[PDB]
């Protein structure tokens, strides 16, 4: 009952995707946007590495895809101010990580305040940082999952928007893991970007209330 | 293929019970019992508190309900050392704790090695303690669950026999989520109490090997 009407939608956002490798989740967000699932576009595809498939999936769905290659920055927060100036010269609303393997540092903090998502393999606040699936065999868990949050100066420690939860079978390889978690991800990434797009995300404390 | 046939069963197990309240979980290890899902029978129920309604479903249901106060003992080991030992009168070959809220000690331990089972209202390692509910509504998680585990001398650190999530909805009161926590607690309790029975856990480490 604001800001939509016949000519005007002002929820809409652009969002802009950090990734590392494949980008297993970025072609849900792709697709969400192409689909109308989410209300936006994807503006463009970072990867801080050259040979990642996942900027072959923004080509082939005719979004900007760049390399910004970090060895060519004399330091991280340096990298990081160059990313960030990137992101802004494509008018990003939303910076969402996809299997960026980098820290977030305080430029990109500084430039997106609350305004940057990660997707986490592990029902946090439970196995923090790299490698969740296999912190979560290793413990002997019987439940895991995946969990969307904003993204603040501490690792995975950000806001929780949305989690989901899936059953670790008996003899569940670390892949076996991954890719049942991976099939939750591709679906609350896509809703967590919606319900930020629509105003309903109200960060409190570490906590986050979810409008109607 | 081992131990059964028309006049043996060597896998059913006596079970014994402590609790400190309501005894909500105790209700459905007696009916799984009576009703032959758990291969066993509730041979006896202590409570550390009087008027606990838990001791009421035990009459009940036709079994043994008793008492021990734990202000009518020197220390808290002297305490275990006599609950173990009324344990032991009734040939308990497992015990489940429902709600009792106290520290299993030494005594209970060397009685009972790997054989005192547990069910914490958190998807642990999460939440460990009390209030744990409480706890994952003042995280901001978006969903919880139970855990049935091995207990071992640190506090709800033993290894996680079987584990249930339920979603966290906004405007959760800790009674809503304590209710939607339970509904699964009821679920899986019965069913870890089985699984023990048929020789199917088997501890490796922190962890369990559910054979098939």
Same mark, same amino acid.
């Given at each position: 009952? %604001?800001?939509?009407?016949? #000519?005007?939608?002002?929820?809409?956002?652009?969002?802009?995707?950090?990734?590392? $490798?494949?980008?297993?989740?970025?072609?849900?967000?792709?697709? $969400?946007?192409?689909?109308?699932?989410?209300?936006?576009?994807?503006?463009?595809?970072? %990867?801080?590495?050259?040979?990642? #498939?996942?900027?072959?999936? !923004?080509?082939?769905? $005719?979004?900007?895809?760049?390399?910004? *290659?970090?060895?060519?920055?004399?330091?991280?927060? !340096?990298?990081?101010?160059?990313?960030?100036?990137?992101?802004? !010269? #494509?008018?990003?609303?939303?910076?969402?990580? +996809?299997?960026?393997?980098?820290?977030?540092?305080?430029?990109?903090?500084? +430039?997106?305040?609350?305004?940057?998502?990660?997707?986490?393999?592990?029902?946090?606040?439970?196995?923090?940082?790299?490698?969740?699936?296999?912190?979560?065999?290793?413990?002997?868990?019987?439940?895991?999952?995946?969990?969307?949050?904003?993204?603040?100066?501490?690792? *995975?420690?950000?806001?929780?928007?949305?989690?989901?939860?899936?059953?670790?079978?008996?003899?569940?390889?670390?892949?076996?893991?991954?890719?049942?978690?991976? !099939?939750?991800?591709?679906?609350? #990434?896509?809703?967590?970007?919606?319900?930020?797009?629509?105003?309903?995300?109200?960060?409190? $404390?570490?906590?986050?209330?979810?409008?109607?």
């Amino acid at each position: 009952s %604001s800001g939509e009407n016949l #000519y005007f939608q002002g929820h809409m956002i652009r969002i802009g995707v950090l990734i590392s $490798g494949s980008g297993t989740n970025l072609q849900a967000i792709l697709d $969400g946007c192409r689909e109308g699932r989410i209300p936006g576009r994807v503006a463009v595809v970072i %990867s801080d590495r050259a040979d990642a #498939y996942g900027l072959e999936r !923004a080509r082939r769905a $005719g979004v900007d895809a760049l390399h910004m *290659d970090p060895a060519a920055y004399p330091s991280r927060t !340096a990298f990081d101010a160059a990313l960030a100036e990137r992101l802004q !010269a #494509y008018g990003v609303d939303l910076v969402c990580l +996809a299997g960026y393997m980098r820290l977030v540092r305080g430029p990109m903090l500084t +430039a997106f305040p609350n305004r940057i998502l990660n997707i986490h393999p592990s029902l946090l606040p439970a196995f923090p940082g790299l490698e969740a699936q296999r912190q979560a065999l290793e413990h002997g868990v019987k439940v895991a999952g995946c969990t969307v949050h904003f993204v603040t100066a501490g690792v *995975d420690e950000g806001p929780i928007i949305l989690q989901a939860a899936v059953p670790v079978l008996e003899g569940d390889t670390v892949e076996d893991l991954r890719r049942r978690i991976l !099939a939750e991800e591709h679906r609350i #990434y896509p809703e967590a970007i919606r319900l930020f797009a629509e105003g309903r995300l109200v960060i409190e $404390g570490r906590r986050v209330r979810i409008l109607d």
